[PDB]
Symmetry: D2
Subunit: 226 residues, 4 copies
Amino acid sequence: AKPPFVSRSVLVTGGNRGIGLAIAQRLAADGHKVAVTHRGSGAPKGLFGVECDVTDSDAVDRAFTAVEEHQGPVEVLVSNAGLSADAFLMRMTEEKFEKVINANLTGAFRVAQRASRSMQRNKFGRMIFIGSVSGSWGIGNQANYAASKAGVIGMARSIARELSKANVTANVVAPGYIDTALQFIPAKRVGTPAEVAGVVSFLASEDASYISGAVIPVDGGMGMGH
Amino acid sequence: AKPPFVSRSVLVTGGNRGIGLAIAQRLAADGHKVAVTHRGSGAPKGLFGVECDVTDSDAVDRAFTAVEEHQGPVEVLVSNAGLSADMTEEKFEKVINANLTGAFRVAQRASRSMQRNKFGRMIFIGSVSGSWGQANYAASKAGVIGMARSIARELSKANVTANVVAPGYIDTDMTRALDERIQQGALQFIPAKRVGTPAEVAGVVSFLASEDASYISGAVIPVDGGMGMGH
Amino acid sequence: AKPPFVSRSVLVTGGNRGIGLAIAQRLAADGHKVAVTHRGSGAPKGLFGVECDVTDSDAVDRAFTAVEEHQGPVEVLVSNAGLSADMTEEKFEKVINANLTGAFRVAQRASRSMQRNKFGRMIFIGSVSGSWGQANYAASKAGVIGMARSIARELSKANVTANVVAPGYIDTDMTRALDERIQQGALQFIPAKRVGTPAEVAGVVSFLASEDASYISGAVIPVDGGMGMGH
Amino acid sequence: AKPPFVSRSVLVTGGNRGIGLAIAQRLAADGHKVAVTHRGSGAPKGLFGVECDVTDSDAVDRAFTAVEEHQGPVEVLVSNAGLSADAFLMRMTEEKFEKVINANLTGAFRVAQRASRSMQRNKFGRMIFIGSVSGSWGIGNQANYAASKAGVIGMARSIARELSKANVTANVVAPGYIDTALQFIPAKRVGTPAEVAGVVSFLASEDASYISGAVIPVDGGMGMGH
Ligand SMILES: [Cs+]
Ligand SMILES: [Cs+]
Ligand SMILES: [Cs+]
Ligand SMILES: [Cs+]
Ligand SMILES: [Cs+]
Ligand SMILES: [Cs+]
Ligand SMILES: [Cs+]
Ligand SMILES: [Cs+]
């Protein structure tokens, strides 16, 4: 039987634009209480926004605090993701590598860490990490991006191993080419932000309870491999 | 913006019992038109049943035709294993024939109508276990994954996708008849520290049959409480 | 501290032609005692040949027995596909029977002697292609991987390991008879930007047959110039 | 036919102790010219040592320079690896996460970057990254370690995608439990440093030319999965 809906306290990081925005809007339409973080550009009409730079652990702490006061402790964390600085390995700098790692990977650790306490205590948690945006498949021109997104999957699986006994799961959505190279895609087209948002809606629902440590590709078949 | 619901013609093989039954009843409550295959015992009230042994290509043809006349051409195929329970050539070949070749038989029979109508969802249900290292069961379930990926690559241009749901340890009518020692013994290998329900599997199949699953193809979704993590 | 070399009794199925031939000649130059199966044409000078159709369990038994009398019990088994080249139930089942069930047949026949002697290396050679998304070939090669992992899990306690070598696009006698359009066309999908050689495959098999491979079991090694990267 | 031996210029980072030392000694016995980096404890008798902290990009540059003067440009890079600081996600600090990421992941980027120029120019390169030391399989107690080792695999595959056309490959050796929990291992025993070293010897040889982007588990079967 289909489990009854529960309106969850949702935080979507980088939920003001692109895929993050479509996630945020879908989760709100689903009936959840949705908050987003942003860099300054503001949150969309309707939804609760807080400014947060995910490279700053204290700014992550006060974004969560603000969210808990507004709508209750975060039950569903959607970690978008992120940045985007490419380059040939030979031309790629230490600075470019570390900034993408700090935003995309360590940033994911920061928001996950800040959520884990309350999720554990309350015996409910859904951590959903959004790859940007083509992976496991070695692309670029982007040693930094590939490293951060593969690292998020390893991180998620470690969290999943640790916290699944407490009904706190961690899963990854791996988008391919999304419209916010067609030769490599069996669907022969790019996906939409809504097509990503629907997989996140599923992972944020009562139907996803026995999924944990999973990586769900949303790429029209592009990254089939090993 | 959730895509509007579309009532699909659904066929669930081995959908009169266990996980197949939970799946068929979920897809039905979801609003789809749901038929099941069975091997004689009958389909349960509220679902159109047809008899079909998936080792038999002509039986598979007849089952699909019977379904098409009743509720229209199969738009979503759910292939539930076949044979489930634990070495000889005979044991190897029978599980392969039912689990892998049987999966090919139903997929191939579904394919022309799906390509033609520019819509198809093939959803293959792994038997309870892998993929993780059952020589026959492990071969057949690994093989269905390869088959599905091959189909996804061929047919995704025509909006015909193929995906796999890989259940871990799920509470059935035989998992319960299992020895208490192996039941708990397996709990040390599942991070969730509990068995999953047939409804927890039906849930994922509901999602893959829905309009939200359009851009997923060639995927394997584990429903195993984290058991299968690795490479 | 390289472990000292041990001359092993080796059987390479389909080892009289193409990749199987390169493998058998490498293992022989390495210093092993090498036998090959063939389907009538004969084994080449310098290798003990026996006839064996791997769809036939009794032929497999006879081949192993003939090998054991000649050079001692099989310590390293190299299972080379069978059938290679490109849909019906008949086409699906024949490739499955030769490529997957055939792999099970040779593995099962090797197993008791290996467990008993506390040494075994089973090395399964994928046909040229996957695993990447050929519905029959893709199913069978995915299936051998699952089988091998199942065997590795069962038998690794007894120093009997099972591993897979997954070749990409390799220059054979038919890859060359392929259309020039598909040869180059595939080069856009291989980071190395070139086809691999039969010797490049034999090289990996040499390593997995050696004393340096002791702690590898359940692994899949791609020899594909990076073609197969993904998940 | 077996390709003739070529004595390669080898650099093994953290080649003074444990698995790194066994790698270094095996490659030297194979007939290569082997140099190691270390933290201060010195290199072993026979082998060329240079001090290098892989968190320091300028110290990576002068270690390579010293190596090129001694024995010629580095043709085979073995990136060990690394650190080791565990903790429950809730108790894991930003500082602990970032230091393991900086040593194990960004450190791997630094040595790979510093090698890529000359390998590309000379149309030969073997980059071999050593996981420490159990992965893809979500362990711990170690979100940081899991993230760094999964990230190295994504990085390697990006390098492999970029440089394989130039005969510069990048591969990963993923050790399980090595003696420098048995319930999870089909072999029913830990491996040895030499059993790791032998896979690296193979990846550093003329037989490995058509392998690139690969992850080779050396774990007695422990991490079989997806
Ligand atoms: Cs709402
Ligand atoms: Cs709604
Ligand atoms: Cs209905
Ligand atoms: Cs309903
Ligand atoms: Cs010989
Ligand atoms: Cs030799
Ligand atoms: Cs030497
Ligand atoms: Cs030597």
